[PDB]
Paper text:
Insulin receptor (IR) is a receptor tyrosine kinase that plays critical roles in cellular signaling, growth, and metabolism. IR can be activated by two highly related ligands – insulin and insulin-like growth factor 2 (IGF2). Consequently, IR-B has an additional 12 amino acids at the C-terminal helix of the alpha subunit (α-CT), while IR-A lacks this segment. Here, we present cryo-EM structures of full-length human long isoform IR (IR-B) in both the inactive and IGF2-bound active states, and short isoform IR (IR-A) in the IGF2-bound active state.
The 3D reconstruction of class 2 (determined at 3.8 Å resolution for IR-A/IGF2, comprising 19% of the particles; determined at 4.2 Å resolution for IR-B/IGF2, comprising 22% of the particles) showed an Ƭ-shaped asymmetric conformation with three IGF2 molecules bound. The asymmetric structures of IR-A/IGF2 are nearly identical to that of IR-B/IGF2. In one half of the asymmetric IR/IGF2 complex, the two IGF2 molecules bind to site-1’ in the head of Ƭ-shape and site-2’ in the middle regions of the receptor. In the other half of the asymmetric complex, the third IGF2, located in the middle region of the Ƭ-shaped structure, is sandwiched between site-1 and site-2’ from two adjacent IR protomers. This asymmetric IR/IGF2 complex exhibits similar architecture to the recently reported cryo-EM structure of IR/insulin complex at subsaturated insulin concentrations. Interestingly, in the presence of saturated IGF2, most IR-A (84% of total particles) and IR-B (86% of total particles) particles adopt a Ƭ-shaped asymmetric conformation, distinct from the IR-A particles in response to saturated insulins showing a single T-shaped symmetric conformation. Hence, it is reasonable to speculate that the predominant adoption of asymmetric conformations of IR in response to saturated IGF2 (about 84% and 86% of total particles for IR-A and IR-B, respectively) might result from the comparatively weaker binding of IGF2 at IR site-2. In the asymmetric state, one IGF2 is simultaneously contacting site-1 and site-2’ from two protomers, similar to the IR/insulin complex at subsaturated insulin concentrations. Therefore, it is likely that IGF2’s lower efficiency in promoting the T-shaped IR is due to its comparatively weak IR site-2 binding affinity.
Residue numbers in the entry:
A (entry chain D): 6 to 32, 37 to 63
B (entry chain A): 3 to 152, 179 to 270, 274 to 346, 351 to 521, 527 to 541, 545 to 573, 577 to 656, 691 to 717, ...
C (entry chain B): 1 to 161, 168 to 518, 528 to 539, 546 to 656, 701 to 717, 756 to 905
D (entry chain E): 8 to 24, 41 to 64
E (entry chain C): 8 to 29, 43 to 62
């Protein structure tokens, strides 16, 4: 199952939920979210890695 | 006959070539003389053709200057048979100058056709020519714009028309007027002599006129008899010439075998032709190119092509009509740079192509630079074979490779092709065949509307989809092609369904349509390329159910008898289903009661009797902004009636004479479950009156008083033509005139007939006639009484 | 006023409002402010928050899915100007997927220096059509506002308006932000200087708003520069500019440069000085000096290399290109991909253009709004070391509007390695591609199907050669044309001429409806030629021809075309006159109304009209007008000649007047109550063999008179011995048309009155009338004449005794 | 155009010097019209 | 095309489900079977 924008945020804050999303500093690198979840299907670990605390 | 064959030929621009006719006797063809402008009369008094006798096809004269009498040039011209009629005519003379008289005293008869004379300001002696004696038909002539219009029969001032007696209708009259032979026509050297006939009425044979052609001689041009040898020689002469290829059928040397007949190599007979069996068309260069409708006009009726065809249409149904009768091509087929070719459907009946002559590169089918080409054929059913050769497919932007793959799988040329024979990246660049089926969930129909709902579909990125497109149209029969002309197929756009994350089906309901029809519907997706993920469904045929039919058309009722009324009508404009039957109601129309209180005896005695890239770009722009935002943001760690069946007419009996009747007509296309009957059509019809109904029946009873007062009591015809408005009384006394009186309905009712007072002494009479709606009836018997 | 508060560099808030309190004491933001990803919030949590101190934002403001927010008017009550130094995807203010947001509430924002506003996918936002962006932005068309509550739904923007209103397209509408505030509009004289409440103009340097009119010291934001509260257009030394919005002393720039150098932050820049500006790094041709931070011009041509991550970068927006600003040599590849619909050339050539060399390849894909590659102003070389896949260097794909590729009259170029590639450029001519093929020097490095022969310029006009119309003739409806022949080097290349024509009421007709005719090429004098058909007379038509040739890949045959030629067909007989109606307003006058012909076929010179008097029916003089029904009315072969010519040819006075410029006619001097025939025609040419249309016919009867029906003359009677009275009376010899009968009402003295009929034949044949069987006694006879119009006047009673 | 009206066309294009089946039934293209001029008339 | 003459369409689409009045979006706007589906209440 490949999920794309619009619904992707709704998928977020549910798998992630509760805590926020990690954001330190810009410091695009061309592999952010859409070519990782919309272009190709992504598992739960990739979505989890965008959480803040865990 | 001493002369030459003399094939038909024309003279123009001078009179020199006219001398070529000096050594001729019988013309086997048509003569056409036109455009003599530098001509003078004195140059034509020294020219004559006494040897010329017989003209086969027809004769045309136009714009002749100088000629005044044709008796010199054509002294002995006998008969214009009209074997080849110039549009039902055998002689056309138009726009003559200085031509004053006909001169042709030697024209007796024309076998078929008529004459056309027009715009001859000088021609005269037209009132002394008998066309009935000459031509068997005189109703087709058209002779106007001549000098005569602006009885003895004579051609010229010195030559008569040789007026034959009524017996010699076609035999002909000699110098003494005696009838000639039956085969003799118009004139004869000796009366009743077939050998001495100047002309042959039916057929000619070795100086003798005969009615028919005995075998082995066949009827040649319906004018002579020619054997098989000469007819076959003429056919061979045409065979190695440019043509009228002579064939023999029904003992006739006809220029072509008629419908359903085939030329046989062994014998000149026209055998029955196998099936449609039209023809075979050749190609010396084997390369005739089709540029437009006009170039394909000469291809009408061609089936077998003995060469190669190269289509180049720089442009619809026109080529559909011209083509579609072709089956096999001996050479190769090429289609090159045809802009207005949507599909090769028109090229229907093909099943094999030999390709003996090969396109350079050893190719049998060569398609190149075809832009709008979208389909080749309906390969699911249509059969095509290739005997040998290779295929070429380059620069065909709208033919995806599925059709090319079906090419060799149907034609059996799997190994016949080589690498690069079919281009990969140049064909079907705009064609988006993605062979993703769509299934319709359920469909329901009503007499006015029909509902459509199909299964949902989503490309991998649900934002790519940009609505559906529903195509529909009316399908006459069960088959239809999805590729019509470069039109039709009315379309409606569908908003994409909302992502339900159950599952909603897209669905669509039409708006208005024709009940009881066959509708072809199919749905096509509309997505934006990044790959292509389109989708389409098979052509679904739906049948809208029936409803109340339309009203009957043209209700006409006639009266044939005093009790019989004939009724005829037409089927309704909208049958809306197979019409089961018709319902006919007839109701006796009550007569106008007003006549019962109008005294018509006074004044008023008269009595009536009866464009797209922008939306895709907007969608892609929205999507590419969403992706940029997501990339930047995230970060990892009742009445009498009748049931008429299958009939359009009825006869109704049991109706009183001169009685009005209202007919209520309905059409019912259903019989048992509450017949759906249309709203009725109404018509008022009345029978004719009875002849004896208006006649008074009953002797007149008269009562004489002391003061010569007479009371008249006459029994009215209780069954009149409807009713009696008044009674007319014609009473006459001896020695007096027939005085007249009118007794109204009220006068008859209250006076019990009539009450006349103050009668002069003498013998009176009493004659009374009833006036029904039909008219006056019959006067009563004269009651003679002496007062 | 001054700026009381910190500068609070750019920042974003996520996942809780507790961080938002970092906006406590700052009035200007030196960067971008983002508030996004707010889920566990409700409107009661937002009512408390308010930031009156904040005035101006440097880069942009982005709101993305913040729940529980319904109006920013409480959040941002003093936002005035968005600087837009560094945009966010060529947007300065973004409102994306805002739920519960009912109204913007930014009633105080006035000017956005650079950028655009994009608000979409809200489903709850209205009060949008009641705002005026033209007075807020500079380029309105760059906006993009769709998919809200305003468009699909019908959120009623009820607001005071009291409040100023203005026109947008063709109608006036109020310009209000919320239900309680409206856009502040002031006279255009203060175009951007600002304007106080009463309308007095602010200071010239001022921007947006001010407290004291015409005073820089009392302003809230100024366009040029800021310094020490009282801001000036350009501060003098020792103050150096900074971030285009404020200038600072050298000590500040020096200490921040030291703070960046000692603290090795990955993002900090070694700020230097150049033209009294503390910019992060001066461009090529300068070297930073260790002694003084100002960078001195170097003694050598060392370009400023712009190293590219992963050897590739995609350009899709203004903020993507701005990363390359100031760079002149790229150590990577460039991929132009602008999915747009709005022009982006200006910002591109502002940010790009200083580029000279591309180490990698260049690829322009899917760009829609691109019109020319001219924004690469100073591009000279494409090394192509990082050659693109397929061994291509210059790549182009599906550019729907790429028209001009470069100005080859003056621009140089050089491609070291790789081969070109062009496909699906409908507005690009092959002439430009071949001109690159010559200039770049890659002539010998091209192969098959690397340049599409048909896709490039599918519908364009680059024949670059001309044709001359040798001879043109005009007529009734046929237009004969002949032009000089055109021959390519190989006559087989020519596939045929093709003509275009269209009616041209005006001069302004564009180049390249538009009826098309195909022409077969001529055989090799004999000018190709063609004749016209179905031309409406007296109409101007634009006509021009074109040439169709083969692919011509090896050669350079581009065909030719002629310029637009205007020719007007000659004139002719006009149509039938329209609306012919006739009314009699009097017994002698008649009026005629008509309309100009539907087909004028030329300038209508005049109208002609004939009037005549009809004749009464003869049967009206021998009809019985007192029998029943006496109601007098009141007022094939066609081709027989065709193939004949085929064989012959063989292959080798009523009164009238000239009515000018008037559609209303009045005619006098006519017999009263008489039928009249009117026939009118139009003539569009009078002096040279006058030409007139077909006749439009109508009939009109004049109004009846009154005394015409009435009997004139006394009544005479002659009585015989048998008491038979013959009556003589002169008839009205001038009646309304004619008199059909006379009624004679004769009565006895004290008895009834009887009516006698005297028809025309009764009066003529019998010479008057005769009454028979009249007993002696006084009488009274009146005579009435019944004319066509009606009945006359009864004559005086005839008193006599018989 | 057709018989009668094609006469105007052939006086038009010929100047001072088959039919009907080619312009009534078929298209009228000036290709046949010009070569139908009767120069030796 | 709206209220009064569209009742047949409303009873067509949902069959025997019934509806509640409001049509201002179909004689000025158009009907598209989505509003017709949601108008009929189960």
């Amino acid at each position: 199952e490949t999920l794309c924008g619009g619904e992707l945020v709704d998928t977020l804050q549910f798998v992630c939920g509760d805590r926020g999303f990690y954001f330190s500093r810009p410091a695009r690198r061309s592999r952010g979210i859409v070519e990782e979840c919309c272009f190709r299907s992504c598992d739960l670990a990739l979505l989890e890695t965008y959480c803040a605390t865990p | 006959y001493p002369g030459e064959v003399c094939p038909g030929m024309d003279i123009r621009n001078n009179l020199t070539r006219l001398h070529e006719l000096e050594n001729c006797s019988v013309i086997e063809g048509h003569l056409q003389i036109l455009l003599m402008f530098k001509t003078r009369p004195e140059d034509f008094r020294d020219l004559s053709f006494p040897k010329l006798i017989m003209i086969t096809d027809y004769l045309l004269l136009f714009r002749v200057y100088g000629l005044e009498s044709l008796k010199d040039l054509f002294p002995n011209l006998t008969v214009i048979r009209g074997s080849r009629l110039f549009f039902n005519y055998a002689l056309v003379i138009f726009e003559m100058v200085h031509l004053k008289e006909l001169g042709l005293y030697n024209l007796m008869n024309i076998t078929r056709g008529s004459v056309r004379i027009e715009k001859n300001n000088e021609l005269c002696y037209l009132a002394t020519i008998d066309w009935s004696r000459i031509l068997d038909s005189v109703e087709d002539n058209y002779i106007v714009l001549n000098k005569d219009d602006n009885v003895e029969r004579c051609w010229t001032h010195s030559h008569c028309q040789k007026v034959c007696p009524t017996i010699c209708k076609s035999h002909g009259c000699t110098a003494e007027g005696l009838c000639c032979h039956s085969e003799c026509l118009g004139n004869c050297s000796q009366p009743d002599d077939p050998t001495k006939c100047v002309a042959c009425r039916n057929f000619y044979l070795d100086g003798r006129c005969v009615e028919t052609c005995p075998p082995p001689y066949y009827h040649f041009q319906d004018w002579r008899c020619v054997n098989f040898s000469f007819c076959q020689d003429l056919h061979h002469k045409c065979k190695n010439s440019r043509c009228h290829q002579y064939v023999i059928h029904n003992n006739k040397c006809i220029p072509e075998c008629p419908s359903g007949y085939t030329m046989n190599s062994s014998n000149l007979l026209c055998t029955p032709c196998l099936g449609p069996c039209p023809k075979v068309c050749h190609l010396l260069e084997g390369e005739k190119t089709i540029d437009s409708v006009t170039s394909a006009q000469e291809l009408r009726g061609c089936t077998v092509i003995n060469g190669s065809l190269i289509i180049n249409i720089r442009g619809a149904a026109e080529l559909e009509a011209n083509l579609g009768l072709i089956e096999e091509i001996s050479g190769y087929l090429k289609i090159r740079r045809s802009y207005a070719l949507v599909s090769l459907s028109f090229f229907r009946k093909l099943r094999l192509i030999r390709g003996e002559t090969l396109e350079i590169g050893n190719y049998s089918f060569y398609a190149l630079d075809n832009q709008n080409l979208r389909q080749l054929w309906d390969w699911s059913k249509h059969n095509l074979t290739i005997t040998q050769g290779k295929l070429f497919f380059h620069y065909n932007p709208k033919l995806c490779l599925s059709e090319i793959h079906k090419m060799e799988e149907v034609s059996g040329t799997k190994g016949r092709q080589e690498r690069n024979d079919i281009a990969l990246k140049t064909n079907g660049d705009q064609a988006s065949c993605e062979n993703e089926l769509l299934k319709f969930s359920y469909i329901r129909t009503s007499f006015d509307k029909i509902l459509l709902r199909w299964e949902p579909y989503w490309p991998p990125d649900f934002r790519d989809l940009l609505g559906f497109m529903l195509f529909y149209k009316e399908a006459p029969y069960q088959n239809v092609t999805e590729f019509d002309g470069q039109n039709s197929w009315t379309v409606v756009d569908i908003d994409p369904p909302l992502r339900s994350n159950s599952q909603n089906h897209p669905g669509w309901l039409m708006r208005g349509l024709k009940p009881w029809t066959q509708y072809a519907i199919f749905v096509k997706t509309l997505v934006t390329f990044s790959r292509t993920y389109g989708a389409k469904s098979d052509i679904i045929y739906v049948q809208t159910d029936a409803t109340n039919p339309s009203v009957p058309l043209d209700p006409i009722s006639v009266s044939n008898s005093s009790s019989q009324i004939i009724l005829k009508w037409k089927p309704p404009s909208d049958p809306n289903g197979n019409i089961t039957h018709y319902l006919v109601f007839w109701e006796r129309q009550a007569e106008d009661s007003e006549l019962f209180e109008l005294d018509y005896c006074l004044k008023g005695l008269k009595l009536p009797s009866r464009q797209i890239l922008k939306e895709l770009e907007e969608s892609s722009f929205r999507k590419t902004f969403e992706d940029y935002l997501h990339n930047v943001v995230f970060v990892p760690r009742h009445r009498p009636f009748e049931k008429v069946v299958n009939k359009e007419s009825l006869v109704i009996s049991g109706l009183r004479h001169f009685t009005g009747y209202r007919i209520e007509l309905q059409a019912c296309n259903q019989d048992t479950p509450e017949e759906r009957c249309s709203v009725a059509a109404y018509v008022s019809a009345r029978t004719m009156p009875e002849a004896k109904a208006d006649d008074i029946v009953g002797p007149v009873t008269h009562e004489i008083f002391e003061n010569n007062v007479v009371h008249l009591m006459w029994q009215e015809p209780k069954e009149p033509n409807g009713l009696i408005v008044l009674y007319e009384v014609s009473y006459r006394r001896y020695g007096d005139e027939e005085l007249h009186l009118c007794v109204s309905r009220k006068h008859f009712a209250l006076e019990r007939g009539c009450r006349l007072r103050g009668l002069s002494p003498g013998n009176y009479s009493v004659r009374i006639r009833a006036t029904s709606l039909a008219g006056n009836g019959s006067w009563t018997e004269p009651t003679y009484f002496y007062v």
